[PDB]
Design a protein around this ligand. Structure first.
Ligand SMILES: Cc1ccc(C(=O)Nc2cccc(C(F)(F)F)c2)cc1Nc1nc(-c2cncnc2)nc2c1cnn2C
Length: 272
């Protein structure tokens, strides 16, 4: 963590909400665009511990696929966490606003980058607990950076592994389940997992053995990989090292992605 003087920061627009403050877009001194989370007067001891703890963990991460911390303001009030800014925004909204605009290889490359960031976090003994496309930022090189904006607080049942829902067992292996959901989010351009099923219906379907069907136009290898992320038995899921290795090999032999999984049509259209 670098300590930044408040005279170097200008808050411009509110872009979100913090636990005890606001999240802004701004400029950091030529100027550089930044995102800024503040801790406002009246914060509790616990909030200060969590806020500066968050800053400390982010300063420890140095990876291509993890959001970069520019610095912290801790010596003056209000306190601030300052990161790089991504004009393309969060991955879920990005894909939904750009439906069908990318190649299969571009989509799989986004997944490889997300997996590499997650392998790094898991190796550093950091369990994310809220991996979803809404918590991934996209830069102007299409590079995805794992982030955590806090709960949307809506609990993300349909991204969470059964053991984490059932008995609060959050590990890198429950993050692997979440990663499989993110794979499905990417390959569908941001569709809502399980569509209109309620949270209870999703849990019931998973316990009964159902799994999300293949996205349209999805490489067979990619659907196979996401399905193995959704094994009920935690020990049977791939580790992030396995996921990175597979995605890297598929990208480097790109003909491997041309074999597509069968898509199950809901609608039959008959014509001559
Ligand atoms: C200011 C800020 C503070 C904290 C984080 C954040 O990701 N923190 C965090 C906490 C725990 C673990 C991780 C980890 F592991 F990297 F994923 C990150 C990100 C940001 N940056 C951003 N937040 C937000 C943002 C938006 N809406 C609500 N909250 C934050 N939007 C951003 C950025 C950057 N660009 N954009 C478009």
């Amino acid at each position: 963590t670098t300590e930044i003087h408040p005279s170097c920061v200008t808050r411009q627009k509110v872009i979100g909400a913090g636990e005890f403050g606001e999240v802004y877009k701004g400029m950091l001194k030529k100027e550089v665009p930044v995102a800024i989370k503040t801790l406002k007067a009246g914060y509790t001891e616990k909030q200060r511990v969590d806020f500066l703890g968050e800053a400390g963990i982010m300063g420890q991460f140095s990876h291509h696929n993890i959001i970069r911390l520019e610095g912290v303001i801790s010596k003056y009030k209000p306190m601030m966490i300052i990161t790089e800014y991504m004009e393309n925004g969060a991955l879920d909204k990005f894909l939904r606003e750009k439906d069908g605009e990318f190649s299969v290889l571009q989509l799989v490359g986004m997944l490889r980058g997300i997996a590499a960031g997650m392998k790094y976090l898991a190796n550093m003994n950091y369990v994310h607990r809220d991996l979803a496309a809404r918590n991934i930022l996209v830069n102007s090189n299409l590079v995805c950076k794992v982030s955590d904006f806090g709960l949307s607080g809506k609990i993300p049942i349909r991204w969470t592994a059964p053991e984490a829902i059932s008995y609060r067992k959050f590990t890198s292996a429950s993050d692997v389940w979440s990663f499989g959901i993110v794979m499905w989010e990417v390959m569908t351009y941001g569709e809502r997992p399980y569509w209109e099923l309620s949270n209870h219906e999703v849990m019931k379907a998973i316990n009964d053995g159902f799994r999300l069907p293949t996205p349209m136009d999805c490489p067979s290898a990619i659907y196979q990989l996401m399905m193995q992320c959704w094994q009920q038995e935690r020990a049977r899921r791939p580790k992030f090292a396995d996921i990175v290795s597979i995605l890297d090999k598929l990208i480097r032999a790109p003909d491997s992605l041309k074999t597509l999984a069968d898509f199950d049509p809901r609608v039959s259209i008959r014509l001559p």
